[PDB]
Each structure stands twice: as C-alpha cells, then as structure tokens.
Write an enzyme that holds these catalytic residues in place. Sequence first.
Site, short mmCIF file in Angstrom:
data_model
loop_
_atom_site.label_atom_id
_atom_site.label_comp_id
_atom_site.label_asym_id
_atom_site.label_seq_id
_atom_site.Cartn_x
_atom_site.Cartn_y
_atom_site.Cartn_z
N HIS A 74 29.26 46.32 34.89
CA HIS A 74 28.77 45.16 35.63
C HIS A 74 29.60 44.83 36.86
O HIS A 74 29.27 43.92 37.63
CB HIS A 74 28.62 43.94 34.69
CG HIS A 74 29.89 43.18 34.43
ND1 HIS A 74 30.58 43.29 33.24
CD2 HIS A 74 30.53 42.23 35.15
CE1 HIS A 74 31.58 42.43 33.24
NE2 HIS A 74 31.57 41.77 34.38
N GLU A 100 49.84 46.91 42.46
CA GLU A 100 49.77 45.53 42.94
C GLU A 100 50.38 44.49 42.00
O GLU A 100 50.43 44.67 40.79
CB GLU A 100 48.31 45.12 43.15
CG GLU A 100 47.65 45.70 44.37
CD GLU A 100 47.85 44.84 45.59
OE1 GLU A 100 48.90 44.16 45.66
OE2 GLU A 100 46.96 44.83 46.46
N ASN A 159 51.22 40.77 43.75
CA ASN A 159 50.65 39.68 44.54
C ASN A 159 49.54 40.35 45.33
O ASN A 159 49.80 41.13 46.25
CB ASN A 159 51.68 39.09 45.50
CG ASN A 159 51.14 37.88 46.26
OD1 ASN A 159 49.97 37.86 46.68
ND2 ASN A 159 51.97 36.87 46.42
N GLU A 208 52.32 49.34 46.82
CA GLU A 208 50.86 49.39 46.78
C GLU A 208 50.33 50.72 47.28
O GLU A 208 50.95 51.39 48.10
CB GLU A 208 50.26 48.28 47.65
CG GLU A 208 50.55 46.87 47.18
CD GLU A 208 51.60 46.20 48.04
OE1 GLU A 208 52.35 46.92 48.73
OE2 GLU A 208 51.68 44.95 48.02
N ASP A 235 28.97 48.50 28.59
CA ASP A 235 29.54 47.98 29.82
C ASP A 235 30.80 48.77 30.18
O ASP A 235 31.92 48.30 30.01
CB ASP A 235 29.86 46.49 29.65
CG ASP A 235 30.08 45.78 30.98
OD1 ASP A 235 29.85 46.40 32.03
OD2 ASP A 235 30.50 44.60 30.96
N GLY A 256 36.74 37.38 36.86
CA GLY A 256 37.73 37.97 37.75
C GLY A 256 38.59 38.97 36.99
O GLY A 256 39.24 39.83 37.59
N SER A 270 37.19 40.80 34.48
CA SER A 270 36.27 41.85 34.07
C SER A 270 36.66 43.25 34.54
O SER A 270 37.10 43.44 35.68
CB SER A 270 34.86 41.52 34.54
OG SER A 270 34.30 40.53 33.72
N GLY A 271 36.49 44.23 33.66
CA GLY A 271 36.82 45.60 33.99
C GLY A 271 38.26 45.94 33.64
O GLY A 271 38.63 47.11 33.53
N1 LIG Z 1 35.55 34.42 27.83
C1 LIG Z 1 35.70 35.61 28.44
N2 LIG Z 1 36.50 36.53 27.87
C2 LIG Z 1 34.97 35.92 29.80
C3 LIG Z 1 35.27 37.06 30.56
C4 LIG Z 1 34.62 37.30 31.78
C5 LIG Z 1 33.67 36.41 32.26
O1 LIG Z 1 33.06 36.65 33.43
C6 LIG Z 1 33.34 35.26 31.53
C7 LIG Z 1 32.27 34.24 32.02
N3 LIG Z 1 30.92 34.43 31.45
C8 LIG Z 1 30.15 35.68 31.67
C9 LIG Z 1 28.72 35.25 31.35
C10 LIG Z 1 28.90 34.08 30.40
N4 LIG Z 1 27.62 33.52 30.59
S1 LIG Z 1 26.60 33.33 29.35
O2 LIG Z 1 27.36 32.63 28.37
O3 LIG Z 1 25.44 32.75 29.95
C11 LIG Z 1 26.22 34.95 28.76
C12 LIG Z 1 25.43 35.89 29.51
C13 LIG Z 1 25.30 37.10 28.84
N5 LIG Z 1 24.63 38.32 29.21
C14 LIG Z 1 24.64 39.41 28.40
C15 LIG Z 1 25.33 39.38 27.16
C16 LIG Z 1 26.01 38.23 26.73
C17 LIG Z 1 26.05 37.07 27.50
S2 LIG Z 1 26.80 35.55 27.26
C18 LIG Z 1 30.18 33.45 30.88
O4 LIG Z 1 30.48 32.28 30.78
C19 LIG Z 1 33.99 35.04 30.31
CA LIG Z 2 50.32 43.15 47.23
#
Ligand SMILES: N=C(N)c1ccc(O)c(CN2CC[C@H](NS(=O)(=O)c3cc4ncccc4s3)C2=O)c1
Ligand SMILES: [Ca+2]
Length: 223
Positions: free
Chosen positions: A40, A52, A54, A62, A84, A175, A177-178
């Site tokens: 995603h 990295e 800062n 870097e 994912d 932020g 994610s990944g």
């Molecule tokens: N708590 C964490 N570790 C975390 C990590 C990264 C994020 O970006 C968010 C924020 N996030 C990412 C989406 C989530 N939104 S939701 O609850 O509507 C969902 C949408 C969805 N689509 C497919 C499957 C399951 C769902 S739950 C949220 O708050 C939360």
């Molecule tokens: Ca830097």
Amino acid sequence: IVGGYTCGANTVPYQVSLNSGYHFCGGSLINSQWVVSAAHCYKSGIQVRLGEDNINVVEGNEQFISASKSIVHPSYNSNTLNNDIMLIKLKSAASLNSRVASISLPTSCASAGTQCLISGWGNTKSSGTSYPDVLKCLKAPILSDSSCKSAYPGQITSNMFCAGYLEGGKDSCQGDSGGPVVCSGKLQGIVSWGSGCAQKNKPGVYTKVCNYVSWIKQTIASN
Ligand SMILES: N=C(N)c1ccc(O)c(CN2CC[C@H](NS(=O)(=O)c3cc4ncccc4s3)C2=O)c1
Ligand SMILES: [Ca+2]
C-alpha cells in the site's frame, strides 16, 4: 510511532525511508540491492534513503538511491490489505557498513509472546498529528491469534499478526507503514494497518513475513 523512544542515530541500520519529496513510508534493507516494504506504500518516483536519522537534515552517512523497480505482490488486495508486501530494487547497490546494513529473513515464524523492535518516522500522537525529525523505536510483543482475531473480527487473514499493547498508548501509526518488525535478529513483520493508533483493544496489524520467504527469494532471483 506512538509511545516509543528515540532509537539513537544509526542504531537500526536496516531501516529505510521511502521519499518522494517528503517521507511517506518505511522499509527494510534485506541485501545491498533490495528493500522490503508494504504494497500500500507503492507509488511511482520513489527515492530510497538509507543511513538516515534526522530525515530533515543531511548529517552524514546518508545514501540516496532511486528505485529501479517496485514489485507489489500479485495477490495484494487494497480492500482487505491482504498480502501487503512489496519488493523494491535499487538502481545501484547500497554501500554496506556499520550504519547501513541488511536484516535477515526468517527461517520460521515467531511465537506469540516474542518481543520485537518496531521503528519509523511516523505520527507520534494518537489524537492529532506530530511527525518526528529522528527515528523512533518501540519494543512490542507478538500477540496470540485468538486475541488478534478477537480485536478485529473478520479482518485477520493467515498473512497477518497482531503486535502491541491492548491497553493502548504504544503502537505504530501512519507514516510507519512498510517499516520493520524485527524479532531475534530476523525480519518477522511489516507495518501494515490498525484501527486508529495506540487505541485500547486495537493493536497494530502486521504482514506475516515468514509466509513470504519463498516468494521473496524466487522473485529476487529472477529480477
Ligand atoms: N495502529 C497501527 N499500527 C496503524 C499503522 C498504520 C496506519 O496507517 C494506521 C492508521 N489506519 C490505517 C487505516 C485505519 N483505518 S480503518 O480503521 O478505517 C481500516 C481500513 C482498513 N482497510 C483494510 C483492512 C483493514 C482496515 S482497518 C487507520 O486508522 C494505524
Ligand atoms: Ca538526514
């Protein structure tokens, strides 16, 4: 990262920042030319930033390398976030050293109760938005499957696992994610999703990397 602590410059050498004019996702260096991240997080025009701390200042160590290609898992479903995972090939090999190193892939899956380290430059607030300058860290245990499925009925597939605290207050967030979830020196998870951040009874959900080791190896081997 909500409720974490400052890692310390270059103490998580495999941590990567995906940049497109701003930081938008994390990733893990698994070898000198490949990075593992979340599907995603895919976007064109990605620049991988290694060594990295800062992300807003060039302090030394870097390495900025453009992504030559991004391979999103063929079965990735954006609606359920199943599978994912994405592989990124660097245009040129990274220069490995003490501040930039790869992380090992797992040989077996981790058990519930296993302590792991999660890191990233994501939101540090569970209410508003507050992005840090330096890398944040968080130690969190892998939860049991029943506890995970109890928290998110009907949304947990065999390719996901929960990690964190049911009491809330500590979690990964947007932020992050990944990014990596490392347990016992092995990359066991990728920050994927959760309901809000650090909320009670809503732990973070992560892509189960041990389920993809064969796919990663086969894909890297033919690219
Ligand atoms: N708590 C964490 N570790 C975390 C990590 C990264 C994020 O970006 C968010 C924020 N996030 C990412 C989406 C989530 N939104 S939701 O609850 O509507 C969902 C949408 C969805 N689509 C497919 C499957 C399951 C769902 S739950 C949220 O708050 C939360
Ligand atoms: Ca830097």
